[PDB]
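Researcher: Following up on the earlier apo prediction. This time include the ligand. It's chloride ion, with the SMILES given after the sequence.
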Amino acid sequence: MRERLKRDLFQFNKTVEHGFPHQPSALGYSPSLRILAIGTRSGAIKLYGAPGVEFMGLHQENNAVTQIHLLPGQCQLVTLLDDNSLHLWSLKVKGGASELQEDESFTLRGPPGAAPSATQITVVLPHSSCELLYLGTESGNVFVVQLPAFRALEDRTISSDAVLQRLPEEARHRRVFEMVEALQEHPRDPNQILIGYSRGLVVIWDLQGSRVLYHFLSSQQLENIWWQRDGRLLVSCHSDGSYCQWPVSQQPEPLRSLVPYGPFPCKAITRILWLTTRQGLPFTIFQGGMPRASYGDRHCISVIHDGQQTAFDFTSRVIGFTVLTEADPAATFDDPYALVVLAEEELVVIDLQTAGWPPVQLPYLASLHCSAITCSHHVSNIPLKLWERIIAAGSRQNAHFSTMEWPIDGGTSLTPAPPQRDLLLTGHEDGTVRFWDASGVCLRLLYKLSTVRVFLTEWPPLRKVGSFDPYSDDPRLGIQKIFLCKYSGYLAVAGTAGQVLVLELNDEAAEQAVEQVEADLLQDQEGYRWKGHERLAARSGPVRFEPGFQPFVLVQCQPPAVVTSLALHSEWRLVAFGTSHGFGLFDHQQRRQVFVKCTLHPFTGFVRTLYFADTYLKDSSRHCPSLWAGTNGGTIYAFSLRVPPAERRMDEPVRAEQAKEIQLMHRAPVVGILVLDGHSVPLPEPLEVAHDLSKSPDMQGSHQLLVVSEEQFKVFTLPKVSAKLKLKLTALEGSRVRRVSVAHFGSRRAEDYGEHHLAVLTNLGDIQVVSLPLLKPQVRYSCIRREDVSGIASCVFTKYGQGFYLISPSEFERFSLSTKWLVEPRCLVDS
Ligand SMILES: [Cl-]
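Model: Understood. Below is the ligand-bound prediction.
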C-alpha cells in the first residue's frame, strides 16, 4: 500500500513493562507520597503508587542501585550506586503529568592518598530540613553534603577522632576502619544525630555545639539501630543475633538483651524496627538471627507482637523491606499496618492489622515466574459476563488473603479505564495456568488454574510466605499449548507428557470423574517404542474441583510426547492436537476419538500447526467443516469433517476423511495455516458468527488457503489448491518466520476503518507486517535481539496489533505496531 496509508495503520513503539523487574538490589519508600521504589543491578530505578502510577529511570552508569532514599515530603529521591556515587532524582510535572528525571550526581572523594575503602558510603541520612545529606563511611567519618546543587561541606565533617576526643579513655579503643553502621536523626530534635560504629560505640551528637551528649559501648559488634518515635528508647541489633534496648535521657546500660533464637549460635540480626502502637503493644520486626547450624540458609524477617511471634520465610534472598505505619511526623504512636518485603524473586506484603497476618494481593509487580513460564496465549475483547466469572472464581480461591485495600496507593492515574478487556494466559512448568488482566498498564492476576489435581502426586516459628518456587518438581506437567474460547467458556490445555485436557468454566464447585481417553498415534506402526517420559498417572474415580475451569475429559497421547500444536472448535465441540509423531481429532462432547493420523512416513512429521475451517475442499458449491495440519517437512493435510447437527450430537459419531495432502516443494516447516473468504477476510473464530452474524464469511466469492512456512508465504485458491500468490521471505530478506498471527489494524485517520494483515516475528527478532491477501511486505521493525532466543520464543501477538515478549524470566515488555493502541502510563503525583 501507499506509504501514507502505512502511517495511518503502522507505528512501532515499546510502551510499558509488566511484571517483577529482574534482579532487584534496593528498596525505598516515601510515607508522605505512599510510593514504592525499586532499584536493580542494571541501574534501573522504578517507582510505583496506585495502579497506573509508575515511573522508570536509568542511571547512565549501568551499576547496581544499593540504596534509595525518598526525601521527606518532597517529590525527590537520592540513590546510591555500588560505584559509591549519589544521584538526585525528581518528579517534575511537565504537560499536566509527572515525569521522572535525574537532576545531578556526586561522588564523595577524599583527599588524594586516602584509600577508597575509607570514603565508601555506608549510611545515607537525609536531614529533616531537606537541605543536608549526612554520609557515614567505612572509615568512621561522617561527611555532610548540601542539597540541591551537590557540594561537600568540609567544615561540617564529624570525624571519628573528633568524636573519640569527647569520650573517656576506655571508649577510645578504635579499629582502623571504624565503619559507621548507624546514622540517624533524633525523632524529636533536628539538632541531634546518632552515630553508631561497628565495634559497638554509639554516640548522640549535638550538631550545633559539636559535642557528644550521650554514648554507650555495647558488648557485641553493632549491626543496626532503631530510634523509638519519642526518642527516649534505642534498640540495637548485633552480629551474634541479639538485640538490646537502651534508655535515652548519660552513659547507660541495657534495659534488656536477648538472642531471640538461642541458645544455639545464631547469625547476625542485620536490621531491627521497634514500633509503638496506641494499644500499648509494640512491634519488634527484625531480619536474620537464625540459628547458624540448622537455619543459616534461611531468609527470614521475624515479627513480635502481643505474645505472637512469626519468622516469615522467603524462598529468595531479602533485598529490603519496610513497614507502613499510620503515623505521620506529628503522631505519638507508630501503629503499623503492613510489612512490605522486596525479595530477590518477588514482592511480598503482609497485613499487620488482621490477626494471623494474612498476605495482601498484588495489583502489579507480579512474579510471573513463580513457576517458570512455558507458553502464553492472548485473548482480546472478553465478554463482560465471562470476565466477571473468571474474576469471581479468582476471589474464591484467594479467601486466605487479606481484605485490606492496597496501601501503596500514592499518586493519581490520569488514564481512563481500558474500554476493552484483554486476557493474557500463561502456562507454567508446574502445570498451572494464570489468567492475567492484560487490558492496561498493570498486569494483574485474576485467576489461577491447577492441572496437577487430575493426576496422582515450630521454633523458630517459621511461616513460608511468597509464591516463588525455585525447585523443579515434575517437568511433565508443563503447559505447552493453551486455547480459550471466550464465547463458550471452554478451555483446552496441552502438556509436556502428551496430556490434553478440555475444561469448562463453572461458577460453583463440582465433584466429577475426569474421563480418560487414550489416543494411540502409532496404531499402524508395529515395532515402535518410546524412550523417556512415562505417562502421567491419572486420578481414578471422582475428584472435587473448586469454582473455575474444571476438566471433564483427559486425552492421553500414546506415546506421551510433547504436544506441539493444539486447536479447539467450541461450536463443533472438537479438539485437535499434534505431537512429534502425529496428530488426532477428538470429540469432547462424546468424549471419543474421531481419528488419529501418524505423520512419520514421508523430525519431519512434527505437527507444528492445526486449524479448523468451514471452507470448500472438494466442490465449489458446498462448504464442509475441515481440519488442517502442517508439518515440519512442508506437508499440509486437510480432513473433511462430518459434524452432526445439534440434536444428533450424541447419537451419530463425527466422521473424518483425508481430503487433501499438499506438499510445499521448498519443504520448510509449516508455521501458519489460514483461510480467507470471498472478500479475502480470514474466517472468523468458532462461535464468533453465532455471537455476531455480521462476521459471517463471504461464501459467494472463492475462498483462498494461506500457508505460511518458515521461508515463504503462499496463497492457493480453494477447492483446487491452485497457487495464486507467494512471498519468498527467506530468499528476499534472508530471515525466517518464527511465528505469524492475523491482526486487525485500524486507521487513525478514519475512526471506523481497518484491514486485516499478518503480524510476523522473524528469527532475527524483527517484527514484520505482511499484507493480506497480496502478501506484500509493509513494514519491518527491530524489536528483539536475534541472540535473544528466549525472548523470541516467548513473543506473542494480540489480535489488534500489540505484542508481548519476555525481557527476563519474570517480566514482559509490551510493544505496539498499531496506531490505534498505545498502552503507556500517564499519572500525576504532588505533595
Ligand atoms: Cl514507526
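Model: The first strand starts at residue 10 and ends at 19.
Researcher: Noted. I'll compare it with the apo version next.
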